[PDB]
Symmetry: D2
């Protein structure tokens, strides 16, 4: 089984730690990004999410939200916990980074998208 | 101030209910989608997320994860709570829908993207 | 059937003109955005794209690239030419807006995503 | 300087060839995907795009459309031509894959998103 609990690092150098996943699939953790678009000092930020439990897949999908403590922005990640060919666990994720814009008319420029691959620390 | 607590409906006809947002911005709720890509019967599904409180913004960002209970997939939403120039609250969101695929080699086709506009129900 | 040739306007107030679509599905046009994230004056910009011709569908898929001439960025749009329930032609599109970054290490923050709905102008 | 002309391969094993880029930044080429979600045999397919000419940047942004000849779908790619830290040319791209859906009510599920990294072949 691929499990979200534990420490992870991604291709940008960011780290996150995820606690126990409960029977409903709920989990919390903390996220330390290695990169930022703000001029502010990066601070560890909480994450909250769920892993899908339907049919108790060995490679479950999941999502979580990172509530940045140094920015008005929010990031959500979603992806799947895979067991790779070599037996290593790998999280394949895509994310949306939501900017705070001043007016509803600026909404069009508020959402960035990208990938991250996570492996255990 | 734009508050996430309450009942909302979006442009596809889906509804969600969001509970109280605590002092750390955390909230939970339930989501009833009007549409699905599965043949399975739609079931009410839990959501978990956070709204960003940095700088007491009247129009905060947020994200949440919907842990579908009739599918092995997961959706994450992120967006901003706006006060329309009329004065009504509107959630402008973008989402990622992560399908479950059998093999890590099929990861490339597993993520859909889209928009939803929510207003109070 | 839904056809791409003509003048269109979208939900942001932007306009585009699409020329003749040749037998290979190729087309060119010009794009005048109503909105920008730069400080530079908006300039009309050329677009180039293709319409899918497989099975000669009445509601074809398409894509095009807008080569901005007041910015170092690039936008691609992709979507489908629909005949809506009311009989009106509508382009449902999503886009990626690629910013120029100075360093490959900053690639993660360079891609924005969004939607546009077009109707004939 | 990073130029799009030449033969490339990406992380999924797909190949593409791009011809000369003219003074307006326009180019065409062909694309052989290594993967498909259809049950049709993959066929080499044309691509059409532009690279951004503003400020004649060493690492220009670009976009292009792939007009699949074995599917009713369309993919658009956008990204930046980087000189990476090994002095090698790398295309860092993100894409939108637009499915053909029968009805405008199905539009919400028609767009997939992902990444590709291309290096010279
Ligand atoms: O840095 C941040 C927040 C941390 C994001 C880290 C990402 S999450 C995806 C990826 N994966 C990973 O591990 N790290 C990165 N910027 C957003 C705020 C912001 C600032 C400005 N501005 O300063 O002008 C403008 C617009 C804006 O939206
Ligand atoms: O349908 C769902 C769950 C509900 C998603 C509702 C969305 S969330 C964004 C939008 N907003 C909103 O309100 N509703 C919609 N998952 C699809 C899984 C799946 C199944 C198959 N399969 O049938 O095997 C094939 C491919 C697949 O991707
Ligand atoms: O603004 C543009 C060109 C016009 C794009 C219009 C969009 S295309 C999708 C949507 N639909 C539509 O009709 N109009 C909009 N590029 C921004 C590049 C950029 C510049 C800076 N900067 O240097 O300040 C910072 C961050 C950046 O991302
Ligand atoms: O498989 C294709 C064409 C080849 C795309 C290859 C991609 S492009 C991004 C990535 N990078 C790369 O090199 N190869 C891959 N289209 C299927 C999508 C689809 C279409 C419909 N439909 O149109 O009805 C219905 C259901 C569907 O799932």
């Amino acid at each position: 089984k691929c499990s979200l609990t534990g420490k992870w690092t991604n291709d940008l150098g960011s780290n996150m730690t995820i606690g126990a996943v409960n029977s409903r699939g709920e989990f919390t953790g903390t996220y330390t990004t290695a990169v930022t678009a703000t001029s502010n000092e990066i601070k560890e930020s909480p994450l909250h999410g769920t892993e899908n439990t339907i049919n108790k897949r060995t490679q479950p999908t999941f999502g979580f939200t990172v509530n940045w403590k140094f920015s008005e922005s929010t990031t959500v990640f979603t992806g799947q916990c895979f067991i790779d060919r070599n037996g290593k666990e790998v999280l394949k994720t895509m994310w949306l980074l939501r900017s705070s814009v001043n007016d509803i008319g600026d909404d069009w420029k508020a959402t960035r998208v990208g990938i991250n691959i996570f492996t255990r620390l």
